[PDB]
Amino acid sequence: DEITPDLWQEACWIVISSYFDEKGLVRQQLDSFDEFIQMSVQRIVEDA
Amino acid sequence: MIIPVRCFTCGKIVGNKWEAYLGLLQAEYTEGDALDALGLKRYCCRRMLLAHVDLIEKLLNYAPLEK
Amino acid sequence: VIFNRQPTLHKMSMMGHRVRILPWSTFRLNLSVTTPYNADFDGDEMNLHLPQSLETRAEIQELAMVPRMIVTPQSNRPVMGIVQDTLTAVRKFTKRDVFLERGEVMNLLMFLSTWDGKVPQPAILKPRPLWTGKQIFSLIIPGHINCIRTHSTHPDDEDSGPYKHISPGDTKVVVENGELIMGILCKKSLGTSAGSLVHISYLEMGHDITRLFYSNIQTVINNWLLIEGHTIGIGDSIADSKTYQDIQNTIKKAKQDVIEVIEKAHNNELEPTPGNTLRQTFENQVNRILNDARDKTGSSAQKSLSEYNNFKSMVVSGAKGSKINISQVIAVVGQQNVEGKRIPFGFKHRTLPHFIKDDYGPESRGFVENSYLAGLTPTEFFFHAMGGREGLIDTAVKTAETGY
Amino acid sequence: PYANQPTVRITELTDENVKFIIENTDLAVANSIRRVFIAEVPIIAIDWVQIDANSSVLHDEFIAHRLGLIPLTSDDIVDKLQYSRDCTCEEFCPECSVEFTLDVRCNEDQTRHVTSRDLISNSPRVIPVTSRNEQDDILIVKLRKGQELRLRAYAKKGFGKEHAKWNPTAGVAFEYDPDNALRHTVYPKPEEWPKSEYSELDEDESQAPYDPNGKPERFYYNVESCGSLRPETIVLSALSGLKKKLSDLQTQLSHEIQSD
Amino acid sequence: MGKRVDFSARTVITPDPNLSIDQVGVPRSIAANMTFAEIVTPFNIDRLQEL
Amino acid sequence: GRICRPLLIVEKQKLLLKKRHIDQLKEREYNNYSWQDLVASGVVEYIDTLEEETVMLAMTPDDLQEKEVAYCSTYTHCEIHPSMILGVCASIIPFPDHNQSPRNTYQSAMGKQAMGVYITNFHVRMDTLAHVLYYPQKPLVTTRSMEYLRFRELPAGINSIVAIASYTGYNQEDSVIMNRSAVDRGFFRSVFYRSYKEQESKKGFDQEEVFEKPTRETCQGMRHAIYDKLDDDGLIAPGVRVSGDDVIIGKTVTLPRYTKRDCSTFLRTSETGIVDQVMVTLNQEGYKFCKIRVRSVRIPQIGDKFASRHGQKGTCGIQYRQEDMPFTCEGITPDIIINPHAIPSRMTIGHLIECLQGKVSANKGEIGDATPFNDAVNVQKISNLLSDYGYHLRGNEVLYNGFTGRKITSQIFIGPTYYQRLKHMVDDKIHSRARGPIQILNRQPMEGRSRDGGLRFGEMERDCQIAHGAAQFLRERLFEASDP
Amino acid sequence: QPMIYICGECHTENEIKSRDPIRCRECGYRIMYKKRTKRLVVFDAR
Amino acid sequence: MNAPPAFESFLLFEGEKKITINKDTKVPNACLFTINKEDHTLGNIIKSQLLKDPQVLFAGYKVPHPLEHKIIIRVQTTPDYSPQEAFTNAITDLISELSLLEERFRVAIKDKQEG
RNA sequence: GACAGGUAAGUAUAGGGAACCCACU
Ligand SMILES: [Mg+2]
Ligand SMILES: [Zn+2]
Ligand SMILES: [Zn+2]
Ligand SMILES: [Zn+2]
Numbered sequence A: 001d002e003i004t005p006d007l008w009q010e011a012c013w014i015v016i017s018s019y020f021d022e023k024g025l026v027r028q029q030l031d032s033f034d035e036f037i038q039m040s041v042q043r044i045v046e047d048a
Numbered sequence B: 001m002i003i004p005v006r007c008f009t010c011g012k013i014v015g016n017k018w019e020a021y022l023g024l025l026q027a028e029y030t031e032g033d034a035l036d037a038l039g040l041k042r043y044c045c046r047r048m049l050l051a052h053v054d055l056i057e058k059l060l061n062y063a064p065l066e067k
Numbered sequence C: 001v002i003f004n005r006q007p008t009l010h011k012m013s014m015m016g017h018r019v020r021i022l023p024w025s026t027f028r029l030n031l032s033v034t035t036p037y038n039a040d041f042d043g044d045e046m047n048l049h050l051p052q053s054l055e056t057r058a059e060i061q062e063l064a065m066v067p068r069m070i071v072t073p074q075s076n077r078p079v080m081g082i083v084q085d086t087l088t089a090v091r092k093f094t095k096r097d098v099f100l101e102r103g104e105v106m107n108l109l110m111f112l113s114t115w116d117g118k119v120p121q122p123a124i125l126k127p128r129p130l131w132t133g134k135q136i137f138s139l140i141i142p143g144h145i146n147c148i149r150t151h152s153t154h155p156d157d158e159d160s161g162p163y164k165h166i167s168p169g170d171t172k173v174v175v176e177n178g179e180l181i182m183g184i185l186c187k188k189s190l191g192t193s194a195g196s197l198v199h200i201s202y203l204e205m206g207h208d209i210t211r212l213f214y215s216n217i218q219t220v221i222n223n224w225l226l227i228e229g230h231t232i233g234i235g236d237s238i239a240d241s242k243t244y245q246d247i248q249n250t251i252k253k254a255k256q257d258v259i260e261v262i263e264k265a266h267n268n269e270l271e272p273t274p275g276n277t278l279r280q281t282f283e284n285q286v287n288r289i290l291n292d293a294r295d296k297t298g299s300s301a302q303k304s305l306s307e308y309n310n311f312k313s314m315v316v317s318g319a320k321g322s323k324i325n326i327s328q329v330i331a332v333v334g335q336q337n338v339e340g341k342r343i344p345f346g347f348k349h350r351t352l353p354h355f356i357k358d359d360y361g362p363e364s365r366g367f368v369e370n371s372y373l374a375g376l377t378p379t380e381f382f383f384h385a386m387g388g389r390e391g392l393i394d395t396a397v398k399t400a401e402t403g404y
Numbered sequence D: 001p002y003a004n005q006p007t008v009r010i011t012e013l014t015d016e017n018v019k020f021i022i023e024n025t026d027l028a029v030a031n032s033i034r035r036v037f038i039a040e041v042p043i044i045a046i047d048w049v050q051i052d053a054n055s056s057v058l059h060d061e062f063i064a065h066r067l068g069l070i071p072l073t074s075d076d077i078v079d080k081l082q083y084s085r086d087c088t089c090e091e092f093c094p095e096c097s098v099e100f101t102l103d104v105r106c107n108e109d110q111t112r113h114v115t116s117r118d119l120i121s122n123s124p125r126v127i128p129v130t131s132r133n134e135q136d137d138i139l140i141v142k143l144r145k146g147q148e149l150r151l152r153a154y155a156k157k158g159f160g161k162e163h164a165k166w167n168p169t170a171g172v173a174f175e176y177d178p179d180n181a182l183r184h185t186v187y188p189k190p191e192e193w194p195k196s197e198y199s200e201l202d203e204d205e206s207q208a209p210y211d212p213n214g215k216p217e218r219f220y221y222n223v224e225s226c227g228s229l230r231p232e233t234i235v236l237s238a239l240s241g242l243k244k245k246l247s248d249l250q251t252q253l254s255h256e257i258q259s260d
Numbered sequence E: 001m002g003k004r005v006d007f008s009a010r011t012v013i014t015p016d017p018n019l020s021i022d023q024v025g026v027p028r029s030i031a032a033n034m035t036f037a038e039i040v041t042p043f044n045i046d047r048l049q050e051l
Numbered sequence F: 001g002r003i004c005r006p007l008l009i010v011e012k013q014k015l016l017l018k019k020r021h022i023d024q025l026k027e028r029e030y031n032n033y034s035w036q037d038l039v040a041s042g043v044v045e046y047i048d049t050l051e052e053e054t055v056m057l058a059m060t061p062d063d064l065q066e067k068e069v070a071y072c073s074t075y076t077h078c079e080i081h082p083s084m085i086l087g088v089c090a091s092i093i094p095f096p097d098h099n100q101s102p103r104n105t106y107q108s109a110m111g112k113q114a115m116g117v118y119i120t121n122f123h124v125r126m127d128t129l130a131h132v133l134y135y136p137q138k139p140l141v142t143t144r145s146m147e148y149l150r151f152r153e154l155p156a157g158i159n160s161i162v163a164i165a166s167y168t169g170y171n172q173e174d175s176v177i178m179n180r181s182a183v184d185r186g187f188f189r190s191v192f193y194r195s196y197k198e199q200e201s202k203k204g205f206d207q208e209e210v211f212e213k214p215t216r217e218t219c220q221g222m223r224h225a226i227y228d229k230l231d232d233d234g235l236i237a238p239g240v241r242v243s244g245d246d247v248i249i250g251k252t253v254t255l256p257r258y259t260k261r262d263c264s265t266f267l268r269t270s271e272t273g274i275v276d277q278v279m280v281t282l283n284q285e286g287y288k289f290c291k292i293r294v295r296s297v298r299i300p301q302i303g304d305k306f307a308s309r310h311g312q313k314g315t316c317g318i319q320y321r322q323e324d325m326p327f328t329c330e331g332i333t334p335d336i337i338i339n340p341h342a343i344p345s346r347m348t349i350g351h352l353i354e355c356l357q358g359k360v361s362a363n364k365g366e367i368g369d370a371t372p373f374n375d376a377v378n379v380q381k382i383s384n385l386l387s388d389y390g391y392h393l394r395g396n397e398v399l400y401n402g403f404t405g406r407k408i409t410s411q412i413f414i415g416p417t418y419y420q421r422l423k424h425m426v427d428d429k430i431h432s433r434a435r436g437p438i439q440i441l442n443r444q445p446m447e448g449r450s451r452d453g454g455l456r457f458g459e460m461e462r463d464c465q466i467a468h469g470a471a472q473f474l475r476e477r478l479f480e481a482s483d484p
Numbered sequence G: 001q002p003m004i005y006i007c008g009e010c011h012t013e014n015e016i017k018s019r020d021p022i023r024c025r026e027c028g029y030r031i032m033y034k035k036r037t038k039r040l041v042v043f044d045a046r
Numbered sequence H: 001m002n003a004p005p006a007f008e009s010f011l012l013f014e015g016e017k018k019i020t021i022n023k024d025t026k027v028p029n030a031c032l033f034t035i036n037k038e039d040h041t042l043g044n045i046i047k048s049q050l051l052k053d054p055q056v057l058f059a060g061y062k063v064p065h066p067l068e069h070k071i072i073i074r075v076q077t078t079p080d081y082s083p084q085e086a087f088t089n090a091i092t093d094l095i096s097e098l099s100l101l102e103e104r105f106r107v108a109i110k111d112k113q114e115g
Numbered sequence I: 001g002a003c004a005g006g007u008a009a010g011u012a013u014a015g016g017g018a019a020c021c022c023a024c025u
Helices: A005-023 A027-047 B018-026 B031-038 B043-050 B056-060 C031-037 C054-063 C085-093 C102-111 C133-140 C197-204 C207-228 C241-267 C278-304 C310-317 C323-330 C378-403 D027-039 D060-069 D231-259 E028-033 E045-050 F019-026 F035-041 F049-054 F101-113 F180-184 F342-346 F349-364 F379-388 F459-468 F471-480 H040-052 H083-114
Strands: C002-004 C014-016 C018-021 C027-029 C045-049 C147-150 C172-175 C180-182 D007-013 D017-023 D043-054 D098-106 D112-115 D139-143 D147-158 D169-175 D219-225 E003-005 E008-015 E023-026 F005-011 F044-047 F129-133 F158-164 F175-179 F190-199 F209-211 F241-243 F247-249 F251-254 F260-262 F272-282 F288-298 F305-307 F313-320 F336-338 F412-421 F431-433 F455-457 G004-007 G013-015 G032-034 H019-023 H030-036 H056-062 H070-077
Touching: A005 F019, A005 F035, B018 B031, B031 B043, B043 F158, B043 F349, B056 D139, C014 C031, C014 C054, C014 F459, C018 E028, C027 C031, C027 C045, C031 C207, C045 F455, C054 F471, C085 C133, C085 C207, C085 C310, C102 C133, C102 C207, C102 H040, C102 H056, C133 C180, C133 C207, C147 C197, C197 C207, C241 C278, C278 C323, C310 C323, C310 F342, C378 F101, D007 H083, D017 D231, D017 H083, D027 D169, D027 D219, D027 D231, D027 H040, D043 D060, D060 D139, D060 D147, D098 D112, D098 D139, D139 D147, D219 D231, D231 H019, D231 H040, D231 H083, E003 F471, E008 E028, E008 F313, E008 F455, E023 E028, E028 F431, F019 F035, F035 F044, F101 F305, F158 F349, F175 F180, F180 F313, F190 F247, F190 F272, F247 F288, F342 F349, F349 F379, F349 F412, F459 F471, H030 H083, H040 H056, H040 H070, H040 H083, H056 H083, H070 H083
Parallel strands: C018 E023, C027 E008, F158 F336, F175 F313
Antiparallel strands: C002 C014, C002 C045, C027 E023, C045 E008, C147 C172, C172 C180, D007 D017, D017 D219, D043 D147, D098 D147, D112 D139, D169 D219, E003 F455, E008 F431, F005 F044, F129 F190, F158 F412, F175 F336, F190 F288, F209 F251, F241 F272, F251 F260, F272 F288, F272 G032, F305 F313, F305 F412, G004 G013, G004 G032, H019 H030, H030 H070, H056 H070
């Protein structure tokens, strides 16, 4: 059930692999722009 | 982008080795074993093969400018 | 042509040169002139101005030419000197046990431009002719200048004890009648320092003679270095297991001392020194302990160094590096400091989230207990990055301040 | 006051390399021989290229560079060939050049490998090394469908000094004093230095005892050929060319002295 | 107090031990672009004519 | 805008992560288990700085491991891996934890300058400026992190046999000697693409622009450059050689040698190459709009900038043919030689370790791992491995002087190392002037080499000349040579 | 006179005349490329 | 742009003397041979042969500048001997060396080929 | 009328600036 250190190296690197597969590298840019378009524009229009 | 024709250091022909190296790799030889089989003794040539990245396939993924 | 490198800090930043046209697309400089220009070949670009009239040409030829600019009025001492490979090579060359065969002396002699054309009597005739680097350098030296210097590694007690004029280590330089009688040349004897051999050459012989002197030193010593060889590698960074163990013991003892001091301070048994709050006193004690540990470790590493070690070669010749540098490479890197203090508690009573609160230990406050070769644990790496950032910022600000 | 009496021993000989030893000769002579192997042995290689069409992902200079790097069998044709510059023909001629033509077009969904096989020579005696009759052909470029590559080239004589492509050798291992008897090097820790293949020493021993009267003899060579020439051909041509250079120098010296 | 000036070149610098300290290597292209005015005299008239 | 990083959660003294999680992640392709699933399961958790202030964190599970004197024993999180603290540029550095930090900082920028394959589809992009290396190579020594920077897909640099030795002195002061034979074989050769653009504007019926092959009899503003290279459309064709100040886009404008003024676009002065390709379109306003991409093959030469991954940069001092270069007992010769004087003060011990492990990996037929904080890798282990392959355990070797064949008294450190050629090339910086065009406002020399400008004899230069006392030279520099 | 251009999308050849609005007659695509010149071009294989 | 043509290394430019002779006035019986489009190969072999020659008080070579392809050989002989004669004899002896080595190598290659 | 071939006559084969940004030593 646990992870011995020898396994732990590969385990942590697999974790990082999955993280980067999921997210990418410009995830912050893409998510910020997507949130802007999706929410903020309508919020501004309504607040007007 | 493509396997260099000669080893930069010593000048041994390696351009005729990339396909065979890939064949061995898919034949499950380790990289060192494949290099030895191809005869790349000097680590200059071994580098020439190991470090190579054949970008030409990615380049060929694009359609030509002309039909 | 006048030759310049921004920023133009002093007179020697702009100096005259005679043009020689060679194929490729760069200005080719002699290595010596780099020092006055404060130039390195890391991509530095330089400007060239061509005087257009005979009057300006004469002005430059008589005032700004590098030979005339050899000695600066700023500190009445030469600005250029033998540097880098040439300096290390000459230090090795002028060692006592350097002997040259007929052919080797042959090549070096003809590279010596000012040579009179007479092969000197070899310092050894039987069982086989052999010259010495000292002989060849005596040929290089111009005129009949007399000079006395001391090699960098010259022990002080030698001057008092016996063998005063016959150095067991050959660490005393004596040029007489323009002949290197004895000693190992180094930065002390060939660099910009006052009373250096180049300085005395300029003072006695003409600036032109000193120019030829520089050129001959560089050419001959480089050609000999072709044979001699000089390198640096992991072998020169490795130390013996005994010295590794000694350094580990020193570090462990220093850590234990710091722990004892911390425990005493927490028990309140510690008391402030005059003119210092208790916290200042505690910091002073910790810093003193760690500095002593680093000094002891560096001394141990330098002792462990062998005569073949290239780091020691280079530091001794004065071409590059320092004993502190060798200590950092071999033994602990040492304490990291920001604003002249240990790493501040950026977090809440914590340098990093990975330490308990109110931890004033060496590791907690950023003491790199590992040598560069041994690598750095992530926290030590971060703290070292902080220190380097401090240095870079200091540079980037002092540039503008000093310019103004 | 006169020449040595060099002797030779071929310890190995294959189609791709020759290993031998030369004794009773000067280190200077040995090193010059090595340098001639590397640099001053004539060879035929592509040096003129005209790209009628090139749709490949690679550009014309890239393709020409690879074509030049391709080696060509030059066992005897080079000797007959004269340097293009020396030759009188206006543009090119058999005496000074060899023509090649390449023309490929990818008309299929699978990648087409334009290898040295496609290099069509005019003189059968001169051909790509791999095309000779297992070694595969030297890849030049890959073409996806709808692509083409047509070009006409000329290979001429030349030696490595002018450009590495004429260099025949593919690794010239040179050695002498396997055991460090002459002490030309200095091992701070000789024990930790692996024995040379030619080393003749007991394992406990690190290096031969210093020889004050020693001099570099028994130079070991291992010349690997790039397939352009048989290694023995490389060695013989190198010696011939060095002798030729010395003879020409003698002629020039005689002319100069006679004029003086 | 400061100006841009003609007859000035600029380029990267590389080491060259084989040059006297007072010498400077210059590319042929820069030398060609640069010219120094020389007055004609019977002494140098032939040389300048050849130039 | 609140920054945040992931962290493995710790309860009591054990990670919430488990071997089952690791296996599911391994099989992520099929079972579709993913990082999002990890986050949902709650093994990992995002933490920002403010929360970090209270979090108690551990390097690795080793800290969680019980100890004779428990330091914390109350951990709450654990690093996924310490190396993650680095960024993109810093990640490509092998053994960064063996260098003085400022050198890592320098490498962070020299990496940005390295030439490689900036994008797979470069063949179509008409980017204003681009550089493409002929033979990129993934480094023989790689941090695990570059697997995600995709450096393998788009490497920028070549693994090169480097000997850290003094040789003829031409590599002194951060200079590097280079193997001319390697350069001939394509070592570090690259191609430089420059994109020019032009458009014909019909702003006014009175005055309009047109692409064409102008003729002296009609148009007036022609230089002596030949327009034959152009075609009937005022555009050059691909595969055409071109030199500096050579018209490439013949354009003309209708005046209010008659009724036509030349507005053609010439090739940048001192430049040369071949027209890679031409594209013709209409801009937003229908006007004809042509972009021309021109490629020039840059062979590395004296003065070109190169750099390792360890803050060690230098210009190619000189190039020696293979026979001139020193050689091992084998035929191997160093592609590059770098003065040893770099390392002492620089503390780029990572450079040396990289060279050693590169030799090891090349001999072993593998890719070395230079992940920073990896206890499993150390100099002693690397040296033992290297010795196993019949080499000196520290990487030293016996080299022979190329010119004379004689052994070299010292044994040279030599081995593979990843080098990278920076965009700044001497050909793009060389510049000189003798009475070129001058500014309009003041008649002083123009600025910038693209305009054939003149160098600035600045205030400190004036002051240095004042100190020299060269009054006449100062007068010439500031008055007679600038704007009499 | 002919001035054959290759369309980007359909990769089709088509003549274009001066003052002619740039648009592939075949696909209405506005991006075209000049065909490779016919001039003699040579490259020493250095 | 400034890169010299590769052939320039070995090709004598129009009107270039392959070899030039001067007398080193500093000492008697001393000559300087400036050889163009030559390098360490010839320089080293000739120097070694001359050093082998006993009458030669002085023999050596150097490359004044690597970017240039010229070499200078300084040779001083005994008064009863000429540097020109020493140079010629050294070249002759090297030529004999090469001829002997060539024929012996041919013999060895043949013999290895048969077995 | 068109179109294909030939003969004769005329035509065609002077230079930006600012701003900002990035990067460099
Ligand atoms: Mg600099
Ligand atoms: Zn190789
Ligand atoms: Zn011909
Ligand atoms: Zn279309």
